[PDB]
Amino acid sequence: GSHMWIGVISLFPEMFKAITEFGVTGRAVKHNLLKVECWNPRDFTFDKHKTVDDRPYGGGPGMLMMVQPLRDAIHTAKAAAGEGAKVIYLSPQGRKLDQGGVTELAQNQKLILVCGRYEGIDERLIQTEIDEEWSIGDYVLTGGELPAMTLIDAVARFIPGVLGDGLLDCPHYTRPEVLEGLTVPPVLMSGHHEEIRKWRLKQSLQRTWLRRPELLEGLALTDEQRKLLKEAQAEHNS
Amino acid sequence: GSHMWIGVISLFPEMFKAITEFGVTGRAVKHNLLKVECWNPRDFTFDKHKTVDDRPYGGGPGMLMMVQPLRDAIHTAKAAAGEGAKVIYLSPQGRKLDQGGVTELAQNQKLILVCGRYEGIDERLIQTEIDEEWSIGDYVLTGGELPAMTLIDAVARFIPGVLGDGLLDCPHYTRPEVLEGLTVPPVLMSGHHEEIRKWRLKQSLQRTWLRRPELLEGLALTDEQRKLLKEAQAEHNS
Ligand SMILES: CN(C)c1ccccc1CNc1ccc(C(N)=O)cn1
Ligand SMILES: CN(C)c1ccccc1CNc1ccc(C(N)=O)cn1
């Protein structure tokens, strides 16, 4: 339907089984809502030892991905994608991912995700082959595969059929009714649908204010949200 | 040595093969620098259908993780860890991970990572069993397993033997010397070690200023960094 195709360039394509074989994303793949197709630069080498790294000009302790096998793998993925695939490189230098960015990326029917290893890739391939650079957060990983899988999982939630507002989630409770002396809030047992809705929203506002108050500055709260937030801050200050 | 033990509670422990079987983290596991041990709540069920989810009090469309199998799995992991393991729950409601937070977390010799599925876990288990909540970024995933693997990979880079300053990385170049008409900066072929160091630092300052200027506000630049940043901004404005 609104299915999504994701090409992946990675030296460790088997890592992607973590999303393609399990849970909600594994079901999306099995039901053809999400297709994930991997190309490995190692298969595009020609020397006897299948070399995929190379030395940086200028010296330094690290290696980079070797240009030729990576470029050839990218070209093959682009040819398989046909027209209109956006090519994304995952790196700490990229645009910081957030939920608005996920929903932007989810608009593409095709994406190609390039997973860097070693110290990364040659800057000229970014210029010539990459459309957008994205980061999953301000921290350093050993390769771009976990960022690519994170991005796939986040976008997959927007594909119609895969599943069944700016604020943090409210607390949730399940059985039993008392757990190490802690009881479930009585409103949640009241059956009063509207009191339950307002309690949950007031809790989300309170938790957002206490934990991540900067997230509130970016929202235009509704009148109801403004009132419940005021109530929660009054209670907090009592 | 400074090895690290990470207990994981997950309904999909096989996802963790993505970090334990491949690349730098797979080597860390093989060489006993990193141990990752998984417990699955499904193995702590007692009904015929091995039920691991439960309905939220108050209604709503989602399910939560069932308390009893999850609590029992957590208790088993804590007993295996012995004393001093910090128990972390991965969620969007948690403290936002960044590199300073990774280095804080890397100080622990033992961690237990609880991976939520469905709409998450009962709030009272957070109160009774979880030490810290952490988020990998402001976006929603289908479970906490990719956040846990991201955290493991980021912390593993701090374990002595696993591998071979606030700014984004400089561009890097490898063979060939000309690539679709784009040449390598001559300084990197100069062999002048000190000119190369300064060029790389000036590029990191320039890229940080242009892409993520808020990161600069949190740094106390050195005199040399202040001078190279000034030079880069002068060049940019020429
Ligand atoms: C080895 N490095 C630093 C590297 C350098 C450049 C590109 C890819 C990599 C692979 N590592 C990544 C990738 C993404 C993220 C992120 N925060 O999105 C963190 N680490
Ligand atoms: C299903 N949800 C929303 C959920 C709710 C609460 C806990 C765990 C989960 C599992 N999903 C996660 C986990 C972490 C992150 C993150 N940004 O660190 C994103 N999603």
Swiss-Prot record, chains A, B:
It is found in: Cytoplasm. Homodimer. The keyword tRNA processing applies. PANTHER family: TRNA (GUANINE-N(1)-)-METHYLTRANSFERASE. SUPFAM superfamilies: alpha/beta knot. Its EC number is 2.1.1.228. The keyword Endoplasmic reticulum does not apply. GO terms for biological process: tRNA N1-guanine methylation. Belongs to the RNA methyltransferase TrmD family. Keywords: Cytoplasm, Methyltransferase, S-adenosyl-L-methionine, Transferase, tRNA processing. This is tRNA (guanine-N(1)-)-methyltransferase. GO terms for cellular component: cytosol. The gene is trmD. It catalyses: guanosine(37) in tRNA + S-adenosyl-L-methionine = N(1)-methylguanosine(37) in tRNA + S-adenosyl-L-homocysteine + H(+). HAMAP family: TrmD (MF_00605). The lineage of its organism: Bacteria, Pseudomonadati, Pseudomonadota, Gammaproteobacteria, Pasteurellales. S-adenosyl-L-methionine binds at Y89, G116, I136, G137, D138, Y139, V140, L141. It comes from Haemophilus influenzae (strain ATCC 51907 / DSM 11121 / KW20 / Rd). Its main location: cytoplasm. It is an enzyme of class 2 (transferase). GO terms for molecular function: tRNA (guanine(37)-N1)-methyltransferase activity. Specifically methylates guanosine-37 in various tRNAs.
